[PDB]
A paper describes a structure:
Further focused 3D classification was performed on those particles in the open conformation, also displaying that no omicron spike particles were in the closed conformation. Moreover, a partially disordered loop (i.e., loop 853 ) in S2 of the prototypic open spike becomes structurally ordered in the omicron open spike, mediating contacts between S1 and S2. Numerous mutations in the omicron spike overlap with the regions that interact with neutralizing antibodies with high frequency.
Each S1 subunit contains a receptor-binding domain (RBD) and an N-terminal domain (NTD).
Numbering used by the authors:
A (entry chain B): 704 to 832, 845 to 1143
B (entry chain A): 605 to 673, 686 to 703
C (entry chain C): 852 to 949
D (entry chain C): 704 to 801
E (entry chain C): 999 to 1048
The structure:
């Protein structure tokens, strides 16, 4: 730190990063009279006392199940038109072949969505019915989602095609087409760099972007801990179901855990107290399960709302909120689909190679004081120039760069120099 | 009404609901016609069509159902939206 | 004696102070640049000009009123010092947890 | 209100205000067999007949315990560089001593 | 039953504290490391710094 020293970058870098987010969890269903009394007719008549509880547990689970479908729909089904990308893939030198659909594969998924789909190992592949058998025998069911996994891929394909062919215009009205190298110029202008920087470094920027994408692909395979957030959901659900099922072999103080064994070997009026003991234990087990599911559903909903907001604000626009869509100055984002979640790829701008200069707040020329319009004054030891604040590019000080205000008696660190007035030579 | 059996092959339903000792009004929903096989199970009492509309009652796994016009209940594959292409 | 115990946190109270001091030093010596890449230094009364320009006021208003703004800022900080103390609760959000 | 009248300010003020936010709570641990039964050996053998009513409590409380640390880290550990402020504390007239 | 009531109350309070902590982290990112234009987010007035 000093009070007349400033540092300015002379160079830049393009960066690509990732972000994982859960969206939905597993849908479940229960039947008390099968779970509690299995196939006994004597236990059904006794359970018929507690005739207002099972209705309530079933209502809770049904609510959760519907909320999951609502979550997924809110996140993905934002636009109601299915755009398509042109058959000639030339976009000014940028190379999007790693995020666009692959027609050769039987499932039209991009090369990265296959890595994402293979790195998350699931439990129930196939809903036409093992950790899924005994449960079904015990009254517990797993329901299939409403949107198959070949519909979500179409939605993400539509989003990508629209964004790379029209910009941000398709999220606020009718889609309007524009060349791609001339959309990146708008984005550069939006982060604070003049647009002639892109047209003069176009082939460097294209190469940097392509290399960044290559690294993104190679990195996911290694370090098998990227997908932790999406694996935790599966683990939690499986563990909860195992506990619930195995809880059926406890006596809770009775003489046995088998209903027919209790009914025989005892006379009715004291067999019934044992049976009621079992019934209360199992009801309490169900209620614990349902409460835990409700809390987890609330957490997943918070996450899904966050994901929907990121979709709206980073993919369909260009945000100025800091660190919302990655580290750096945001340029643009791309979505990808993953089991039970979504993945964002954020593309950002980073300054690279800085230098020292001395600076001043104003210039006194003829008793007037000049201030920069859109830049900052710098000196390299001998001469004074005016430059933009995010990229070193010096120019001469003229009456077109600066504006006048007052006289130079009041400003603290004012210095002396000349201002050009680009009119003398042309008329004289 | 239409009935959905969530985990069976309704070739093989009459053996699962024990259709032999049920009321003659339940046996209409065991073999009947309009049988259709989905991924969530399978469905009896609704007719499958080839159009695509937007979802009304969600059956699951991509299939939805509706009541429209002689009247009957139809089942179909939900549509995602119109098709369009930028130039 | 009944079986209920309390565990200590991972970050001690002297590490959080270091973190906040780092944030303050970075912000007052480099502005918003240190949060989006490498840190780049800039004089402070030439940082306030950028922020004024950002809220919609030309930047000569600062350079011509610099000494008034400095005094106003100092007085406001002193008042914070006094008020946090001499108001009754002022912290019932953090007392409620305990 | 009128249709050819406007009001424009001619002066300004610098305001400083505060905002308070909780970030974490206390970490707790519980032991069933001593809470429920105490130093009685006959109690534990009867307690064993409830399948698992302490494995679950332990898992729940441990989840809460680690979540607290995650909260604190996410709030404070934004930047992994430890900046320091220069020895000379002159910043154009502003006084950051407090 | 006493223990179970205790644990359930703890879970709910933990969820509330987590919502608050997420808000605090967002405020750190957007008020301290930058300059915000959202109204009444970073104080009442036109934001300068935090
Ligand atoms: C600005 O940064 C870029 C980033 O590399 C520099 O580009 C490299 O510069 C030289 C020129 O050919 C070579 O070492 C590399 O081949 C360039 N990059 C690549 C990817 O090939 C550029 O030189 C920098 N500009 C200045 C003036 O330093
Ligand atoms: C766009 O990226 C893809 C993926 O890296 C490139 O595909 C590689 O390009 C050549 C063509 O065979 C070979 O080096 C690799 O075998 C290709 N990989 C695959 C998986 O096909 C592609 O070349 C890039 N750009 C263009 C214009 O194709
Ligand atoms: C500071 O920068 C200025 C501008 O580049 C330098 O002045 C020019 O230096 C070039 C270098 O070849 C000369 O050809 C020019 O004659 C100089 N300016 C003019 C208008 O003729 C200056 O030399 C730099 N100072 C230092 C110490 O590097
Ligand atoms: C910029 O130029 C002005 C006028 O050319 C300088 O103002 C004079 O500075 C001298 C010091 O060398 C004083 O003795 C005069 O009283 C000043 N006022 C006049 C001559 O009217 C000013 O000092 C220059 N700025 C510098 C050197 O930083
Ligand atoms: C910056 O603010 C501090 C805090 O108010 C000032 O310290 C005071 O200085 C006066 C003059 O010596 C003392 O009478 C007070 O007791 C000090 N206050 C405290 C709390 O120690 C300081 O003077 C101000 N200016 C500078 C340059 O530090
Ligand atoms: C002439 C006059 O009253 N000027 C005012 C006075 O309140 C003080 O000098 C200053 C406070 O910063 O504000 C200005
Ligand atoms: C050089 C200048 O014009 N102003 C200041 C001056 O107070 C001193 O030289 C140093 C530390 O105070 O920082 C600079
Ligand atoms: C700026 O100049 C000083 C002069 O010694 C030097 O020590 C410092 O490293 C320079 N800063 C940069 C970023 O080059
Ligand atoms: C149901 O079972 C029959 C057995 O004959 C089988 O052919 C059919 O494919 C099964 N249904 C599904 C959806 O696989
Ligand atoms: C639906 O379409 C398929 C081919 O697309 C055809 O074979 C079938 O007969 C059609 N069914 C109806 C009911 O239209
Ligand atoms: C402004 O509003 C009312 C019109 O009803 C009246 O004061 C006056 O005629 C209006 N003036 C102009 C210029 O329209
Ligand atoms: C209000 O304006 C006066 C005159 O410009 C001056 O005191 C200052 O700008 C404002 N008042 C205060 C107390 O700062």
């Amino acid at each position: 730190y000093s009070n007349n020293s400033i540092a300015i970058p002379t160079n830049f870098t393009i960066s690509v990063t990732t972000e994982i987010l859960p969206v939905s969890m597993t849908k479940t269903s229960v039947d008390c009279t099968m779970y509690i009394c299995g196939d006994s007719t004597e236990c059904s008549n006794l359970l018929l006392q507690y005739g207002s509880f099972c209705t309530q547990l079933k209502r809770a689970l049904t609510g959760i199940a519907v909320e999951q479908d609502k979550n997924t729909q809110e996140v993905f089904a934002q636009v109601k038109q299915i755009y398509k990308t042109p058959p000639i893939k030339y976009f000014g030198g940028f190379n999007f072949s790693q995020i666009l659909p692959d027609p050769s594969k039987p499932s039209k998924r991009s090369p990265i969505e296959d890595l994402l789909f293979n790195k998350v190992t699931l439990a129930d592949a196939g809903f036409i019915k093992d950790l899924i058998c005994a449960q079904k025998f015990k009254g517990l069911t797993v329901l299939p989602p409403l949107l198959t996994d070949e519909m979500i891929a179409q939605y993400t394909s539509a989003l990508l095609a629209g964004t790379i062919t029209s910009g941000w215009t398709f999220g606020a009205g009718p889609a309007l087409q524009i060349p791609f190298p001339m959309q990146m110029a708008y984005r550069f202008n939006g982060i604070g760099v003049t647009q002639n920087v892109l047209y003069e470094n176009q082939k460097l920027i294209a190469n940097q972007f392509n290399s960044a994408i290559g690294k993104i692909q190679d990195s996911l395979s290694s370090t098998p801990s990227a997908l932790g957030k999406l694996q935790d959901v599966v683990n939690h659900n499986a563990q909860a179901l195992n506990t619930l099922v195995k809880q059926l072999s406890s006596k809770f103080g009775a003489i046995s855990s088998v209903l027919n064994d209790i009914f025989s070997r005892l006379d009715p009026p004291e067999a019934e107290v044992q049976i009621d003991r079992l019934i209360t234990g199992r009801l309490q087990s169900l209620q614990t399960y349902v409460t835990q599911q409700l809390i987890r559903a609330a957490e997943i909903r918070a996450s899904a709302n966050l994901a929907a907001t990121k979709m709206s604000e980073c993919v369909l626009g260009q945000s100025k909120r800091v660190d919302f869509c990655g580290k750096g100055y945001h340029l643009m984002s791309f979505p990808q689909s993953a089991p039970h979640g979504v993945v964002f790829l954020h593309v950002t701008y980073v300054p690279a190679q800085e230098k020292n200069f001395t600076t001043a707040p104003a210039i006194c020329h003829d008793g007037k004081a000049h201030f920069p319009r859109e830049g900052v004054f710098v000196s390299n030891g001998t001469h004074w120039f005016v430059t933009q604040r995010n990229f070193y590019e010096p120019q001469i000080i003229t009456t077109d760069n600066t504006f006048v205000s007052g006289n130079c008696d009041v400003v603290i660190g004012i210095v002396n120099n000349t201002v050009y007035d680009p009119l003398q030579p042309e008329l004289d | 009404v239409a009935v959905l059996y969530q985990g069976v092959n309704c070739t093989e339903v009459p053996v699962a609901i024990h259709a032999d000792q049920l009321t003659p009004t339940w046996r209409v929903y065991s073999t009947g016609s309009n049988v259709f096989q989905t991924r969530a199970g399978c469905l009896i009492g609704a007719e499958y069509v080839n159009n695509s509309y937007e979802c009304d009652i969600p059956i699951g796994a991509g299939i939805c159902a509706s009541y429209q016009t002689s009247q009957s209940i139809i089942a179909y594959t939900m549509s995602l939206g119109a098709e369009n292409s930028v130039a």
